[PDB]
Design a protein around this ligand. Structure first.
Ligand SMILES: NC(=O)c1ccc[n+]([C@@H]2O[C@H](COP(=O)([O-])OP(=O)(O)OC[C@H]3O[C@@H](n4cnc5c(N)ncnc54)[C@H](O)[C@@H]3O)[C@@H](O)[C@H]2O)c1
Ligand SMILES: NC(=O)c1ccc[n+]([C@@H]2O[C@H](COP(=O)([O-])OP(=O)(O)OC[C@H]3O[C@@H](n4cnc5c(N)ncnc54)[C@H](O)[C@@H]3O)[C@@H](O)[C@H]2O)c1
Ligand SMILES: NC(=O)c1ccc[n+]([C@@H]2O[C@H](COP(=O)([O-])OP(=O)(O)OC[C@H]3O[C@@H](n4cnc5c(N)ncnc54)[C@H](O)[C@@H]3O)[C@@H](O)[C@H]2O)c1
Ligand SMILES: NC(=O)c1ccc[n+]([C@@H]2O[C@H](COP(=O)([O-])OP(=O)(O)OC[C@H]3O[C@@H](n4cnc5c(N)ncnc54)[C@H](O)[C@@H]3O)[C@@H](O)[C@H]2O)c1
Ligand SMILES: Nc1ncnc2[nH]cnc12
Ligand SMILES: Nc1ncnc2[nH]cnc12
Lengths: 467, 462, 462, 461
């Protein structure tokens, strides 16, 4: 801890005594993250982020710790918070704080504390920090800067946004003329969206359900709402455990994939028509479901009438970014909550004021409806987050080097956009991931590269390719 | 009566073909929905379509849909081994010109395409092209440019055919616009992937009746076809290894649970026998090429493969495998049609009990169509609904009638709009009995879409 | 040549059959290892075996192994649709009496068995029996009881035949000892399970070419055949439901990831239409019977099934499905051999475009053998190695030559010892390239076994 | 004023009670027996010494035995398998239990002794419930006079049954036993599917490692090895299987696994030269499943790929040569039950060394050591069998028989198939499954009764 300043107090975490444990897990995670550690080795000497001052808002996990220390190793200063009240690993936050890095994050924040933590990254010594870069996951830091600290955006060169919901929010701002700095959509790298969003939930959804309930999943009935990247991975997390999985969708193309993948496609509503009434609920279907998982990024996809119709003792959880996928407000207003342990509540449908300890008519809600993989387990594993976070590092370097905030107004207008990283970098990330598994990629011969019209070094696919 | 404008193996198979067409109509709700929707409107009235695609039962439903919508057609297969003779006979017996049989020679294959191009010794008054792989498109450009002046567009089925169109567009040699039917999601991520998942193990079983469980496979490629092929084998219990040049596709294969390997030491294909990973290839019981590229199962790989391995290709063209080396150097024993033992002991004769042979399926041609029946009707429903929609769109645009200045503005290779892709998918889902949920207006607003779609930005990869 | 003591479809298929037998030899290392180990010793010299089992390529390798070890045989198939005509031709062309073709009538089936029993109009001097399903055993006991005075034993292949032997034993009507080959682990938990995994989806694809992914299946039974059948369908992407009467087998299906359902409300089959779960059956695209029981897909079930559902049976006998009801009430339209549409609109004729029909495969007879080729050689290797060892063991015991007092002590139905089961399994493992580890002396002492094996008590269930 | 217990923290009792109430809803066969038999009190007078993992599932078992009339004194059969909230809930209910997660070996033995002795003297025990045979061995070696008054032993697990059969062969077994392990609703439920659920669970909790795409070697392919291999293959691991039994190896091949040996040609001669170093150098995870000794040995451990995970899911830790690692290599605790073992030497280690292995649960049963063992709905089958076996042996009253009758009854037996099927039926109904009833004609056709049993005793499922 020689580089940690004497007297360092610029952080807030649950328990600094967990730092040695966190450092032990960071060292393991470094060995599981070859793309990110390869960027650390390749660029540390060039210091491409020297002068960068990064506000970061993303789940304060061990994986985020390796990301933070990579940005620091490349020259950046950072101030960090989590993007969810339940997703921090307190040992990761402690290790980062013990390293002299400002971090405001603990598992089990209240909503007021969550906002306070973001504000502590924004303000240093009671005044706006001279931030010049933003790294966000979900858009909450982006929103607070645009609404409450707009003058800070005059000095910021860009935003790198991690997740589908956050990208949607950026595109709405761009369309409405309210986005003030350019952004890189990190989500839509293939080594992010088709790795993290899908395989990460495959690994971590059944993990969180087991840790929270220890329920056998084999032989039971699950309903997965959504079949995008998260819904695909979630459905596989459950099917590979032997659940009988049904899938709901509004997108007929994603529904077609679910059929061909071996799932029955059903709707909570008769004929698919959500008219707001109890009569619209397919009560026979919902009365057979043992587990419902929301994956949509949309609002109220597990609604009050579905919750009333669910089979007794069903588990309810959400793995989309925000908890408004499930009408938990209805359950707080009408039913009695019994905490089993942190992030596991029985919700007794017998009434609001009390409950019988042996009542059989309850639901189990995980993580109070917040992202369940991070809330009840540890989110995605290091070797998957390697892809997402190598993209984050490259996106930070790119936007920082472009220096948007220094441009004249005429140049700024030409560069105010939301872009993705070029395919060549997506491929280079992927190659490091494959080498991490010991995989061996074949090199095209010159004749073969000519035959298919590509360079031997790639890129290997047109930009239209969907993988 | 009096209809002779066709060439098939056996016209007497027509009644059988018609029975299977009627079954296939029940398996193809998107395509049959287009028949019902557009029959009275006759949107293809006046269309004269040169068609070149595998003359299967599924293609028969496509042909009769085009005809029911008003078109005239003249048809050939795009592969020497892919025709189902009962399908060809049923089409010929319906009065539709078709020149196709299973087991054509290369010369007969070319003659069949020419019989679609020429009627009564003169260029037919064609105005539309439907192609799978680009062979008919190439012949028109090289040999019949004057016909292309009167053709409104090409609708191209498959990855390799689209690649050939883009080369022509790049070189300024493409003469008419095209729709890339391959890259509809209800084509590429249905047909190319799940179709091969269904039909690869099918063709191997029909050709060899080999147990696949417990044996080692190497799949060359992990694009859409390689993904579906690897699953076809893994779901049977094979231990599947995957080779790739694209590291993103290789990453997917690792995450999907496959070991990623190369036939060459350190992935370097330097042409020498020393570069071959002989220990790896000596353990492989089955190799499948899926790339659309050239010579990805080469002579040195074939020399190194384990005795009695099966060799096949599911890409469009047989040059994925160096079959020419095998014809020059090794003795071929036909087991039955489209199944050959290749004896590595020499070129002139073999011991009937020799143990050192490979089994090649379909002489290296597309194995699912050559040794089985290709993709099933319910999957081809997606591909062929897109084909019908693409034919309607290009025919209505009437490119051949536009002034030169407008042609220059419209000469391109495009995909169908996402809204149409979604409408095809919805009929496919309904066919399974699936129930798609309707967004409320507030939910549609929340995610920025209309309640009727499209539901995803054009950048979305699914 | 000049051999005429046979009846097959087409003797000219013999060369093709021999090509496939030579391939099959390379896929059957346990059976060919017995052929090698014992050919010099001639342990079946003097044996005269009546054989009744599906006349497939795999059975041909079994027949030629028995002959190579010294036996004479006379052979028939145990099912009207299971013969591979090229296999029958090759065996006949080798000078071996075989009476078998694909597509026998029931009368021809019985005639073929009688042609093995009789030689030149008189009972052959048979002294051994190999049976699959018990039909030959039954005919001998009822119609030719004097022949059993010379027969040393019966080796019975399958679950249904063993049940028939045990019923005779319980009733005191069994006249010679038997080996239950079915219940070797390398038979029951290899052939019955994994063989159906390989061949059920194979037969459905060849008969219909239907996409299976995404569709609903109901498998009746979850014994060894039901377990393998359920996997055959699930691995293709079917949504599989399982019915069972045995709660332990049902518990396995639940844990294996299947929903357990009954065709009858609350599981009570009272014979009324009101007892049918019409909502369940109206959603089923495919039903497969696997039970060895009677009328498990009954008339009321057939009436309630979803339009265009496929109906098939993979148990030994066709009475699992009430096909008699369908012959009496509904109109049958042959699509192609072993594939019938059964039109529920009535008995006298049908509309060619009628949508209210079911598709029955193999007329309800064993579907993997009827519509495909049954189990693959590498699986049948285990079953047929056990058959050869069982024939050697009973032939050497010479039961028919014993004094009546020693006959009483040896009249039983027994299984082969576990040591032989293990030795068969070892050859199967080596065929995949698998490497079995050898216990150290201290480890063998620790778990209480010999380094040689057997490794498990006889109670062990695997 | 109840003090006859020792647990980590009695204040965890309310949490444990909340989890027991959930578990009751997941255990329909066991709770069905509790409801059926509580009024008849079939275990009134039974005094059961119990030694089995003190989990929430075992808590539901204990409370069922008590509800049926039994008194019990309880310990865990493993130093790391107790869930402290379950032990607290049982002690708070007034039931003697001596168990905590993280016992030393000395404490483990003291805990079993506290069940045997009450107030310094042998308790008036008359029944034994054991998992692995440790309590059974102590009674036979040290308290034979207590066995004179004990009616029987109900033994949970494969290893314990083997030890019983050894005693029976040697003529040293003193009371009859029921082999609970070999009910189909135990062996082919718990041993297989329980490990499928809980092996990947424990590896994720210990390491948070991605498993997809990586290489695993599973030693053994019996029931535990079958379930373990599936636990990893369903996560996307590339799984290789080792076996000494060719029949189990045949199953692994047909199940889609490559069957390999750690030793060249399978010959384990004790030397480094016998190790397939190329194979072991590719393995990211090794799992032992055998019930045998030293199946992941020192030379295998030296040859394993850097950073590989090593764990055991068989009953005893001697499947892995952890003693070699303690003697030669430096151990760095990551967190409880997770250790990095640095192959650079014994004295110390560099915190950033790359040449280490990760050992879970110090080689003890990993599913219980690093997670919570099998889930309630699977343990339902095992523990309903245990309850039935206790009732059966207690009713037979072997200890009160004349010497001549004892000699006739001294055996190790399984429960009848009819009971196995009735347990299975409650399990199926718990999933909402509907079993079909045979018609009289169908029952006649296949030669069974409509009510079962449905299979001969030889049937293997
Ligand atoms: N928990 C995690 O670790 C994690 C990881 C990545 C992303 N996410 C979040 O998960 C959410 C989903 O992300 P994604 O990448 O899968 O997005 P996506 O757009 O690929 O998929 C969302 C899907 O929801 C479907 N949908 C929308 N409304 C629906 C409704 N009412 N009923 C049924 N289906 C409906 C859409 O058709 C779409 O296919 C986002 O909030 C994203 O930020 C979470
Ligand atoms: N048989 C069928 O029914 C069928 C169906 C659809 C398409 N196709 C054909 O299959 C081929 C593949 O189509 P696709 O849609 O999968 O294309 P694709 O572009 O999605 O996939 C081809 C893959 O091959 C890989 N590749 C190229 N050269 C390689 C090499 N030397 N070694 C290893 N991998 C290599 C590429 O990186 C790519 O990922 C095309 O010829 C297409 O027309 C056949
Ligand atoms: N086609 C093949 O290649 C093949 C291979 C082996 C055996 N078989 C035959 O298949 C049949 C089954 O053999 P098996 O070895 O699986 O026998 P098995 O005893 O293991 O299984 C049959 C199962 O059917 C169940 N069952 C009985 N009646 C039922 C009913 N009314 N509803 C639901 N389930 C019911 C039983 O409980 C049992 O579990 C036999 O006729 C056997 O000879 C066929
Ligand atoms: N952790 C759990 O929750 C749990 C559950 C049930 C049983 N168990 C324990 O797990 C162990 C295994 O039990 P089981 O029921 O699977 O027993 P089993 O007899 O069914 O299987 C053990 C297997 O190990 C194989 N084997 C033995 N020595 C070997 C060697 N040197 N190399 C490779 N394979 C070898 C045997 O051939 C056998 O197939 C026992 O100790 C049992 O008590 C643990
Ligand atoms: N482990 C993790 N760390 C950070 N962000 C995540 N998103 C999903 N899993 C995550
Ligand atoms: N059945 C089929 N018909 C036409 N084209 C195909 N391409 C792949 N399968 C096909």
């Amino acid at each position: 801890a020689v580089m940690t300043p004497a007297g360092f107090t610029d952080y807030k975490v649950a328990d600094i005594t967990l730092a040695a444990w966190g450092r032990r897990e960071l060292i393991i995670a470094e060995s599981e993250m070859p793309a990110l550690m390869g960027l650390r080795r390749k660029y540390a000497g060039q210091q491409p982020l020297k002068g960068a001052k990064i506000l970061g808002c993303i789940h304060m996990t061990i994986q985020t710790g390796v990301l933070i220390e990579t940005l620091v190793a490349l020259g950046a200063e950072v101030r960090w918070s989590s993007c969810n009240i339940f997703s921090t690993q307190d040992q990761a936050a402690a290790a980062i704080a013990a390293a002299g890095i400002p971090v405001f994050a603990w598992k089990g924040e209240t909503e007021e504390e969550y906002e306070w933590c973001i504000e502590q990254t924004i303000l240093k010594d009671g005044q706006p920090w001279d931030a010049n870069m933003v790294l966000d996951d979900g858009g909450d830091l982006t929103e607070i800067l645009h609404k409450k600290y707009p003058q800070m955006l005059e000095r910021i060169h860009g935003i790198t946004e991690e997740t589908t919901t956050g990208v949607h929010r950026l595109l709405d701002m761009l369309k409405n003329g309210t986005l003030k700095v350019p952004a890189i959509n990190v989500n839509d790298s293939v080594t992010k969206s088709k790795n993290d969003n899908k395989y990460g939930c495959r690994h971590s959804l059944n993990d969180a359900i087991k840790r929270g309930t220890d329920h056998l999943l084999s032989g039971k009935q699950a309903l997965v709402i959504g079949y995008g990247d998260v819904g695909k991975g979630s459905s596989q997390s459950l099917r590979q455990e032997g659940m009988i999985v049904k899938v709901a969708e509004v997108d007929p193309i994603c529904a077609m994939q679910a059929c061909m993948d071996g799932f029955e496609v059903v709707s909570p509503y008769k004929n698919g028509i959500n008219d707001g009434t109890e009569a619209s609920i397919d009560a026979a279907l919902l009365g057979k479901i043992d587990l419902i998982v929301t994956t949509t990024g949309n609002v109220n996809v597990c609604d009050a009438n579905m919750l009333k119709a669910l089979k007794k003792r069903a588990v309810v959880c959400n793995i989309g970014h925000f908890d408004n996928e499930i009408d938990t407000a209805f359950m707080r207003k009408n039913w009695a909550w019994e905490e089993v342990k942190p992030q596991v509540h029985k919700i007794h449908r017998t009434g609001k004021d009390g409950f019988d300890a042996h009542n059989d008519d309850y639901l189990i809600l995980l993580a109070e409806g917040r992202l369940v993989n991070l809330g009840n387990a540890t989110g995605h594993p290091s070797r998957i987050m390697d892809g997402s976070f190598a993209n984050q590092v490259l996106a930070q370097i790119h936007l920082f080097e472009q220096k948007y905030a220094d441009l004249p107004a005429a140049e700024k207008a030409k560069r105010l956009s939301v872009e993705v990283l070029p395919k060549k970098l997506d491929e280079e990330v992927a190659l490091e991931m494959v080498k991490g598994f010991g995989g061996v990629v074949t090199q095209l011969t010159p004749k073969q590269a000519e035959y298919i019209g590509v360079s031997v070094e790639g890129p290997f696919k047109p930009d239209t390719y969907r993988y």
